[PDB]
Amino acid sequence: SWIERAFYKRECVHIIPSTKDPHRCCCGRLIGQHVWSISKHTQLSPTDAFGTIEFQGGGHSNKAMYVRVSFDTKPDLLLHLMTKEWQLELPKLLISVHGGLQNFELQPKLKQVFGKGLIKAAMTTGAWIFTGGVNTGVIRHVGDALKDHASKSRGKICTIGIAPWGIVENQEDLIGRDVVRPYQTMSNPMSKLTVLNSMHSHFILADNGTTGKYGAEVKLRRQLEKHISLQKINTRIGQGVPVVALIVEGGPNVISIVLEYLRDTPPVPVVVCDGSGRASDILAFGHKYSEEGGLINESLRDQLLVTIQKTFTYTRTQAQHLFIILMECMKKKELITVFRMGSEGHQDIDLAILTALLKGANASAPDQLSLALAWNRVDIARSQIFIYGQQWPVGSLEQAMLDALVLDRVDFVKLLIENGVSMHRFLTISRLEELYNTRHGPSNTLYHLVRDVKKREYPKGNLPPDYRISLIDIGLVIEYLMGGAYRCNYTRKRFRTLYHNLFEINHFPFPFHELMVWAVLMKRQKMALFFWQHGEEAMAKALVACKLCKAMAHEASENDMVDDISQELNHNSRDFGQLAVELLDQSYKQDEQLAMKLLTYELKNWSNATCLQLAVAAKHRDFIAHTCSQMLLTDMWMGRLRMRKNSGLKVILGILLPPSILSLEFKNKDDMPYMTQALIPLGRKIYEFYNAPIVKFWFYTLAYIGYLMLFNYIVLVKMERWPSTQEWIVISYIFTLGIEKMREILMSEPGKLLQKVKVWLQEYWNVTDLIAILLFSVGMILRLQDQPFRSDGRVIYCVNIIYWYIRLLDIFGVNKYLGPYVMMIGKMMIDMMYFVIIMLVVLMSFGVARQAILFPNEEPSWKLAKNIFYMPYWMIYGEVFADQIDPPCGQNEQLPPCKTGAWIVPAIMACYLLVANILLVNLLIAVFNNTFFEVKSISNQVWKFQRYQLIMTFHERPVLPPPLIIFSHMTMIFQHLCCRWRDYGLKLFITDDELKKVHDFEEQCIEEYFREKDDRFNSSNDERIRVTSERVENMSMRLEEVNEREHSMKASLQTVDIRL
Amino acid sequence: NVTDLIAILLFSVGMILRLQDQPFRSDGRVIYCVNIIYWYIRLLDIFGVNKYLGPYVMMIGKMMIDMMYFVIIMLVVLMSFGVARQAILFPNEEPS
């Protein structure tokens, strides 16, 4: 409704002057067909012709919006229509295509080159194409180019055409108000009126009142182009949008339009094409034969006059006037870029167009760089802005670096860095908070994270819209997303002190770390992959990025956001994990010991952590299952012991015989010092042996086996009123194990006790241990009383011995073959459960039927439910109860009489036994068999992942086994009281030179991986085939041109031989 | 649906036999036991809704044909051994 109330229209209410034809008025319409003010006396009214046009026919179906406007309307209102009602963003480039209104045909290769150029130019910059609207001549060529574009590309080219309203065929067909109107692409050759072009996007059909006459649109199009060019571009460096003027063929008027474009403030560059003919060819012949602009000698002046008089069929004075207008154009010869087919005329439309825009702007190179940044054309920037000898202002390159960063232009970062711009000198604290607070580029979820951590920190709520996200808030986001005891460098007291005292000290020592974190947080994947290559600590950066992407994917799924976001962040997490795995593979291929040093050393920039800890916290199964991590974990397992030959027996012999300890080959003092917080050799050997995790595990295993044997003795032998010595040892083991599990609860990661309890009950073995310890205390309390509670305590003791015998599988989980077997059993338990369900259905059907037939007169008693399940369950395991299948009855051998329907019981027994024993057992065999391989590979990888958890658990465990652990517990309470009265991991703590060689080894591995990946991509079959096919294409077109030039040279040689 | 119709007709026959006196009441009880076999089997319709139990049930239905062919070959071998054992160990038998 706004279009009718804002735009106006004019209709022909005149005195009907006949002039030549009595029906034809001044407006050209029929004399009875009626219903500027000079001789038309036109009246103004709201519009009645606007909406959408459905182009019926002409191949592809395409919808184009349209509106009928007055020719005298102000262009700001029209612009506002395009920006608001048609939802068109402000273009980064305006193209004005002018040419002859008569239809013409060009060369096929010229038409193909011009069409491909116009399509690519309007695609890559997102331009607006301004045509004549109707389907005549150059606009017909533009429509054919857009037809080829619709036939082979994803683009929607905004190709707004402006035509007069009076000349378009079927004017009554386009009458409506926000109504879709079908249109016919057929044009009657008898009618002088022409149809609109089918492949246009918008129409600004302008009515001056007259019909069948031009000139109603040129002024309006010119003021709209000017008004667009006064609008500032989004770079906000101080320039408007650039305007180019493409000229194909043309008539006598297009020289005047070229003059009007050149003699304008600001000037507009003009690109012409050669080979079409008419005004373009005379412009080209003027441009090549021009010398110093307007300095044209007499002979080519007369040649230009005779070509104007011959091609344009003009008189002598008309040709002289056109030559005067030509010279007035040629005064500004620098603005005209002439494209020539073949030769060295840029071999392309678009290089000519874009460099014409570049030197028509004629500004400083920062303005040119901001233009190329807005157009997303790194190729033209590299080829012409960054040419040799280009002067650059101080500080402009860093401003363009910032602008390329905030707009997500990765290749522009690459070009600016290659040019020389360095992150160390560019990155400041202020620039990075500006980067975190940008609004350009793709969408992101970071405002939700900062809102959640602000709600959690100060329980406010929703942030203000004009909120500047500080780096402290970003640090809190890293703390929450990483989880655990991670402490980001922003939240430390040093950076908060620097932030309070300031809002090379403000420069970042590792700027690529901050750029990596910024890129992953604001969901810019290509930027993060670019920043991963550059800088040190690549594997740490990859694992941190993997954890960040996984945890933001989880948080986005938790806040009920778009699921496509969560899928993309999971894909980014899997990509960063795959990078980390390939880096580990490269480091393992180069040097094993440097790879372990890379995996183990403390990362001061990542909360004092370890690459192994970061991989475990990211739950990266493939990282720990890699051979290098497995051998590092094996080295961590043996502690300070070389050994590594017939393991198990030597450490058992050392535990049982203490003088066997000193006959062992111990490791060096500084061979691989994995530490948590950074007679004498005999004592050092004793202390180094007894703190090894393998030694602690075997001591724990021997104590558990001895306790299990004592429990077996106290349940098999009878017990007296008071417990024996063996039962006291078993009770002591249970109590000290419970105290040890309580100490594991208290020495955990969270602060609030319910969170520690929840994170400790997240393991199934811990909750079953707690249930067993409570069951033992209940049974012991019942046993210490008199009868009949002592037998109940004995029964609870038997249930507990079932549990501890099952818990031997925890000890069995350490072996390389038994552990995967155990979790494989755990995987097959689900298929067992489904089998148990179907067995349950069939079993109770047979049980209910058998019991209800064979026992008709029964009272309500719970023995019926027992008889339901009793014999049919044992029928599965080879006991069919053959004496009770069909006993002889109703005869004398006096037997009791036959129950009615007792013969049914063997028949349904036969059906039940067949179904159960032959169907469901064999089906469960099939389910166990066909899911074995996936389950087996998964259990192997999961066991190799949980080796780390086992090693850390046994390293953090006390030296003494549980039955003697009360002495070590008293040692820690005494030490804790002494520390009160007066960092969980195994890092290496290298020096600075070792850090230097580790970093250089990491850079060598990064370059090796990257351009080995490039070598594999370049030597693959698909890439070779594609490359060969494309070079065959260029070869065939060039050889066709060579054949044409060879024919021309043969004709010239024949003429020269005929002459001489 | 056809098994449901057969079961409902069987229940009405058994209930009609049960509402009389002896010996038809025991026959109605026997028909009730055959029907409880059927409804216990028809729990698999409710089980067909779960994402894992449903495919399991129709998978069982697919393997029933291979069971039938096994039952045929077992039937041939089983009656060969049964006829041979009974006809050797019991030479003097009346038609029964």
Added chain:
Amino acid sequence: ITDDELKKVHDFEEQCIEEYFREKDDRFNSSNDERIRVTSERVENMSMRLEEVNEREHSMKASLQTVDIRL
């Protein structure tokens, strides 16, 4: 649905149809077999055209030799 929702549903269907069709065309044109066939055929036309170019080059060399002999 209403009529406007029918309109956006129909336009979404047309977008999906064009996406499927000329993505299928892109997959057909970037496949290895089609590339190999295209390269072989353009090598055929290239070889016959280069044989014609060699014949015309021999004729042009003979004409240039005759013109040099004349002058």
